[PDB]
Ligand binder design. Sequence first.
Ligand SMILES: NC(=O)c1ccc2[nH]ccc2c1
Ligand SMILES: NC(=O)c1ccc2[nH]ccc2c1
Lengths: 213, 214
Amino acid sequence: SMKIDVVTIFPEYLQPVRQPGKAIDAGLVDVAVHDLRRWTHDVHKSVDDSPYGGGPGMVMKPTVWGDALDEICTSETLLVVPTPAGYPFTQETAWQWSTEDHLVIACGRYEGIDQRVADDAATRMRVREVSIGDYVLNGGEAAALVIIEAVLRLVPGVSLLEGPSYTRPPSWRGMDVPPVLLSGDHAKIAAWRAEQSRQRTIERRPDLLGFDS
Amino acid sequence: SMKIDVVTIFPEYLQPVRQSLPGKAIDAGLVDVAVHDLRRWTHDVHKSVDDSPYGGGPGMVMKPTVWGDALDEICTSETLLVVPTPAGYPFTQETAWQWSTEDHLVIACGRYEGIDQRVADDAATRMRVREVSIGDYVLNGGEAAALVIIEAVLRLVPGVLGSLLEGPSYTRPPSWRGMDVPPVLLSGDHAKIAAWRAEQSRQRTIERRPDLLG
Ligand SMILES: NC(=O)c1ccc2[nH]ccc2c1
Ligand SMILES: NC(=O)c1ccc2[nH]ccc2c1
């Protein structure tokens, strides 16, 4: 069983998590979404301020985050902070996190979260700053959705690129399913599929096989 | 001015990003995101979208006749057809920049073990097709990848927003739970601040992303 808390200033953006939806329905995992502004005290509910040292944009204040995480996290929590400057989130990471009791995902907006939030949390719990890929999102919420989906499907009770797949009809718009796939010859099918995967990995992801680019 | 059509068997997944678009950008006709239920193009009363894989194996494959009809209706010769797949080329910020100038993106969201390959192969004979992965992890389907792609692309579209890793950022208060903001940031020596940030970036990139440094 796993508990996931997501903290965000846009809780409505996390609704796609209800599809993970079937997983929540079957009660293996519970996912709860929290509005960060719940932990503000001024009437303007401010969560951001200009950066020390200058630069464009705003930084999320540590005070509000600290109060939220104080309430939501325990010492057993794995605190996950999406950020383009994070360690890479990979399938290995997803396997690792799949056996955790409690994930808390802190979703940043603006130019990021004051670094002391993660630093303070790390004195009490395990903290993981991670990137889901080399592109810029408008905030951590889409990353949270990717992480949740990748992790939940590995929870107990829920190399080379995959080649092309085919299903019926065997001829469509004058394009035939590769004949070997209709042959029923398991050895020849396995071989053809390995060759397809090789071509595809070399072409699209040569890095996976230890080649440049 | 970009139109994005997304085709999926879970259209509700994409509704929050649809509603997150700034009214001003929609009012100015800079952007439109439309989401379509793939089952609109099914042929049978059971609204079947998948079938068993030729050659055997686990899971199911999405039917080419259904996808073929959907894309026939939605795509034109000017369309850039995006197909999220773990077997794709990597989607990066460079990709997002390239696609941000397109008039029409169509994102085909697959489930199970993928879409019959003839769908993309046939589409590629009359439009540009891009199979892409958003990272090295497995999702249940393409919807979360579509969300990522839509966000990354649209924030580059002129209007809709109205190397090395970045280092740490700080804001008020100057002291918090025993941790001080690095005094250099308060120094008013902006050449020194820039050099400090550069070194923080170098150290963080070495620690977290050595791949970025050859
Ligand atoms: N690529 C990422 O993982 C990423 C990019 C931008 C972001 N902004 C807030 C969180 C976040 C994550
Ligand atoms: N990592 C990806 O981009 C990814 C993983 C699994 C998927 N299933 C369907 C589309 C898709 C994309």
